[PDB]
C-alpha cells in the first residue's frame, strides 16, 4: 500500500517536530528580552507620578478634566493585540472579555467607540462593526 509514502510522511512530521522546538527556543529568549525591557520604563512613570501628585496636592485650587469623574454617556476602548497568530488563545480571550464588557455597557444605554492596535484587533472589530476612530498596524516588538 505504498509504504514509502508513509515513511516519507513520518520523516516529514519528525522534521516539523524539530522545527517547532527551535521556535520555542527563540520564543523563550524574546520573552526574556521583553520582560527585562518592561523594567526600564518604570523610573520615568514613577518620577512623573511623584511630580504630578506633588503639584496637584500643593495647588488644590482647580481640578483638571482628567482627574474629575463626570457623568458617563460614551466610553472608549484602546485594544492592543498581536499582528500574527500562532500564539495560544490570547487574542480570542481578550476579545471575549471586551465583548462581554461592551455588552454589559449596552444595558446602561451608553454606546462605545474603539481605537485598535494590531492586525488581529483591526480585523475582528472591522467585522464586528462598532464605531472605530483609528487603526494602527505593524507595531513590532520594540515600538517607538
Amino acid at each position: 500500500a505504498n509504504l514509502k509514502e508513509i515513511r516519507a510522511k513520518v520523516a516529514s512530521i519528525k522534521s516539523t517536530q524539530k522545527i517547532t522546538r527551535a521556535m520555542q527556543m527563540v520564543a523563550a529568549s524574546k520573552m526574556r528580552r521583553a520582560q527585562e525591557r518592561m523594567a526600564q520604563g518604570r523610573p520615568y512613570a514613577d518620577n512623573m507620578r511623584r511630580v504630578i501628585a506633588h503639584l496637584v496636592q500643593a495647588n488644590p485650587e482647580y481640578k483638571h478634566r482628567y482627574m474629575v469623574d463626570r457623568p458617563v454617556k460614551r466610553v472608549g476602548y484602546i485594544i492592543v493585540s498581536s499582528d500574527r497568530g500562532l500564539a495560544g488563545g490570547l487574542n480570542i480571550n481578550l476579545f471575549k472579555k471586551v465583548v462581554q464588557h461592551v455588552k454589559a455597557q449596552q444595558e446602561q444605554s451608553i454606546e462605545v467607540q474603539f481605537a485598535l492596535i494590531g492586525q488581529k484587533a483591526v480585523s475582528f472589530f472591522k467585522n464586528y462593526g462598532g464605531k472605530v476612530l483609528g487603526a494602527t498596524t505593524q507595531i513590532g516588538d520594540a515600538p517607538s
Binding site: 497568530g85 500562532l86 495560544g88 488563545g89 480570542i92
Partner: protein, 116 residues
C-alpha cells in the same frame, strides 16, 4: 434519497447535514496539531453544530432499555426534519451539546436544556 421521491425539503436537509459532517471531518486534523483558536469563526461554528448533530442522532430504542434503563422513543419523520432544519438554521446555538444526547424529538432537547 432523491428529490423526486422524498421531496425537495427532505433532500436539501439531508445533503446539508452530510456537508456539515464532512467539513467537520476534514477540520478534525487541524484542531489536533494546532489549537481550536487558529480557525476562523465560521469553522468554529461548524464544529459546534457538527458535534450537536452527531449527538442528536442518538436515540433510546424500545429494545435497548435492558442495557441502559431509559424507555424507548419512536420519532416521526416530520419531527426529525423540523429539528434538523432548526439546528442548521442556528436557532439552537445557545443549547449546550449535552442536551442533544439520548433524546427523541426536538422538544425533549429544549426540556433537557432547561432542566440543566
Amino acid at each position: 434519497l432523491d428529490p423526486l421521491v422524498v421531496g425537495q425539503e427532505h433532500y436539501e436537509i439531508a445533503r446539508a447535514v452530510q456537508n456539515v459532517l464532512q467539513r467537520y471531518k476534514e477540520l478534525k486534523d487541524i484542531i489536533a496539531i494546532l489549537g481550536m483558536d487558529e480557525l476562523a469563526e465560521e469553522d468554529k461554528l461548524v464544529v459546534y453544530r457538527a458535534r450537536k448533530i452527531q449527538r442528536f442522532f442518538s436515540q433510546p430504542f424500545h429494545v435497548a432499555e435492558v442495557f441502559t434503563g431509559a424507555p424507548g422513543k419512536l420519532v416521526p419523520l416530520k419531527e426529525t426534519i423540523r429539528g434538523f432544519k432548526g439546528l442548521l438554521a442556528g436557532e439552537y446555538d445557545h443549547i449546550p451539546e449535552q442536551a442533544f444526547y439520548m433524546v427523541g424529538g426536538i422538544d425533549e432537547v429544549i426540556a433537557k436544556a432547561e432542566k440543566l
